Design a protein around this ligand. Sequence first.
Ligand code: BEF
Ligand code: MG
Length: 1092
Amino acid sequence: KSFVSSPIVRDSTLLVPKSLIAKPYVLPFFPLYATFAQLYFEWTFVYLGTLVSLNILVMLMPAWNVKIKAKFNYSTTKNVNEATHILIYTTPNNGSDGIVEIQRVTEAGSLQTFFQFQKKRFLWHENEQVFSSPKFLVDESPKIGDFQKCKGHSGDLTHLKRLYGENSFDIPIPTFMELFKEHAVAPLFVFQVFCVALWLLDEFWYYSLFNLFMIISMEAAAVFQRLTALKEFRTMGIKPYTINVFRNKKWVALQTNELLPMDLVSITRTAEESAIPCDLILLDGSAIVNEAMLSGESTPLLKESIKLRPSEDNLQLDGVDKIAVLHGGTKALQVTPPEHKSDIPPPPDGGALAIVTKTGFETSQGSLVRVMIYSAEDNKEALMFILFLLIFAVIASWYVWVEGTKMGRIQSKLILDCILIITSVVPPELPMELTMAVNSSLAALAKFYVYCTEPFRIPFAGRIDVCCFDKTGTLTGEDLVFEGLAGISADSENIRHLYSAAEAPESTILVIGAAHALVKLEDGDIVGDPMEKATLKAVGWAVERKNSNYREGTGKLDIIRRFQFSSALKRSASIASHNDALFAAVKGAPETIRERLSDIPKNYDEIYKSFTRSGSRVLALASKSLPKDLNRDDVESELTFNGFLIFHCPLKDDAIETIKMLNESSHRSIMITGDNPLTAVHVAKEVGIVFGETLILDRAGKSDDNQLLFRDVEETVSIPFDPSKDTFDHSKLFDRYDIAVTGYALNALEGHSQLRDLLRHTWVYARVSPSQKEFLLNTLKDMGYQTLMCGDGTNDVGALKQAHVGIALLNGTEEGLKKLGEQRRLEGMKAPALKLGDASCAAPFTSKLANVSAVTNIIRQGRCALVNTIQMYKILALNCLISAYSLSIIYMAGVKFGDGQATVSGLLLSVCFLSISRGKPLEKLSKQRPQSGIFNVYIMGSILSQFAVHIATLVYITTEIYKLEPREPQVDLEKEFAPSLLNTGIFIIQLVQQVSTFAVNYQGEPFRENIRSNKGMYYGLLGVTGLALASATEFLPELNEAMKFVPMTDDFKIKLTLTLLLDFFGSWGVEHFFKFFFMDDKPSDISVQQVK
Ligand code: BEF
Ligand SMILES: [Mg+2]
């Protein structure tokens, strides 16, 4: 039969669809139905009931597991020409099993069986009788001649389209039905449908159907909201744009979707909100790409051609020959056309030609995103809560059943009472309360443009212990900006000195403008390295169509001849002229220029090493006077120092304050970047992640043998280390220095005994691969900490997915977003745009703004959400216990309430219970963290003690009332409501208990705003308290008479009032007692900060 051959699959069996008659559940049942019909032609109806139930269950058994579905519905076969479905048994580390449909199509006279599993294509090869995925040429060892000699596609490529597919990134979104099926498993929903069914068993039809409809509508709205969020924010921004392609020996302009491997393209200077299509390789030309999105580094890399290499012997290595590859998802800042002629004509544009190698999801970015999407992977608190409620309901039901069978009532009424207890175990307004809370949290988050697609992760942001960060794009910008000169002095009064702008002497402002490669076109434009343009604008130079540049504010200047920038001996030059005389400007790397000029300054080396060891990328320029077309070694014979040029990506104006606020709030913040260790350490020290001296783990030598070395930022201390013999001496390393581990040191330390002791004491990780951030976050989660990740690139997509709460920062300002919203509103009535990228595809939260304080806002909302959840759970527990006791004990006595009393009390207390959720958090972050879960000594003790206080109060007052009036031993449960004294003596105290169970437990000061600032609940409690205290002391005889209350004596009034006050005060006091003695709100051990 078939045998799929791929590292994703493990086993595979074909499947043929069985008819509607041969299904396993159907054949056996007809004999049972015939037997039941024969026996029928009371007690027998339950048999038909359970038979129908088991039949319907057999039918729904398949849908939960795909293995059971494939076993029941389809029967395995051994002929690939007749099966129409195939089961795929995936490997342990790749997703889950599934069923994929075998498609067929006839092309060129031959049918081509094929399907597609996990966005990875498969095809049918008859020679080996296996479904084999395509293998590209670049993966197989290629001779470089195979790439050099290719001449594009020719003929009819109707087979390549089938074998490789279209270069398209289409991510699937889940349908509404599966998303609803995910929600319809939750314990609350199944409990609600179970209880409404139990009630429908005997109650009315209209009320039950209305309740069921109101339950279904909430889930419908929730799934609609989540599905809209998914549909908007689950995609990578990829828009096809026309490029030239060499097909049929002529340059014809195709789109980006119709690209195949071994196709000649001509890439130009990439415009805004666009990227390189797919994995290309330079065949001729040059470029300057920016790997900030995919690789995650700041400096723009310089790519070169592949033509000069020998053709026959050498092999395409992707080692030494890494300077020619171009990934997909990076921007090309500058491109140069090919120099000499080849066997193909040059492109019609000014671009450079290159070869495609991989397309679609098989490229690097596509592979990362696909492995994130498909290869992906507590509820015990809710389960224990349900079991607790059920235990107490069962106790009460046993008591009421024994008492009923002792009194002599029929079984039907006892069953109805035991059903009513379990039906009333939970308030009816719980779904509306939960929906209101979720919608309020979402609409409060969405005012900072923070859209969330999984609302059940908002409570996760309350107890965050570790906050991870990405450097490039998240904390700093991704472009180099001109900072100012340096080093043009001889006083040695201060090394780090930046002549910010326009403070240079005449020589430096002449040289900065004479030594460049920009040029103005005829139609009006400027081309060149954007950093050169940036410095030429910052100094204030203006280039014209003629190479002469002027209008700087002092005069004019013209260029005679300019030179190129070679990869080796990296530098440039230029020959300019002025009104006075003629000079020659030179601008190149500092070390190469240093050997060139004669007059070596004194602070040259010091300034170079001081500005290069911390992030910045210096450029040392020099000049020389030239008196009145010549060689290159003559103009660069000897020069004169004229100044530096310092470029570095600038911090976000919001990072320092956000990190300080997260540090002063018992959080631990670390940095996981991809840049070199020096820049990472510098930015982490400037922001406030590390404080003291910093050590770095990196390779000791160059070649091999896995020997790490603790080395300072400078050359002061060099502590050697060996991951084979030595071990971390904590007292001498971790106490005196904050260390930062690189990627190679983290790779050579795998399997070490103290790897976790290392990970506990490192705050900065530099030069890590996109596959090691996942390992770091998985280890931090396995240790026991709660994690967070805030990035923007494509390399940190797996880390964003694996964290407990992920955040993806897009680009955009407040003004631009407000203007876009206003324009959209105006268009519906009658600044650069934002790109969705690949980080927003995996992160649940997606801050459409660019600033970093989104992390602080999300944590501030998560604290409030968690507090609301805990308070609601505790109040539900108390109300359940009180209602169970009330029913079980009271109802077995002669206590029945009127209608108006119950109506008013229910209205007011329901208003309060619905107003529980509404509460605005405080603008400050505190060091105390909310409690997680109800089940612990503090909350359980508080609940049980408050229940005990209420029981004691109620027992005392019942004894007092039975002292006033006779006990009436004989009781009947059919007598209607009648004004009595037990009635009022119980009702007033029920009201006061329901007031106390809110007023004592609601108040949370450090996490959200006070109760008085919650006007709804405050006014509700005030109204109910006024009602109770006006009914207790009969302050208003008209109100007491209007509500069917019996007139009381004086001593009983005094006793009742004192009992109410003592009940409330004792409850509050014992709650405060447990809160003071057993709070236990402790920050994590890693969160504490000590002076090293
Ligand atoms: F530099 Be980060 F990995 F985006
Ligand atoms: Mg980034």
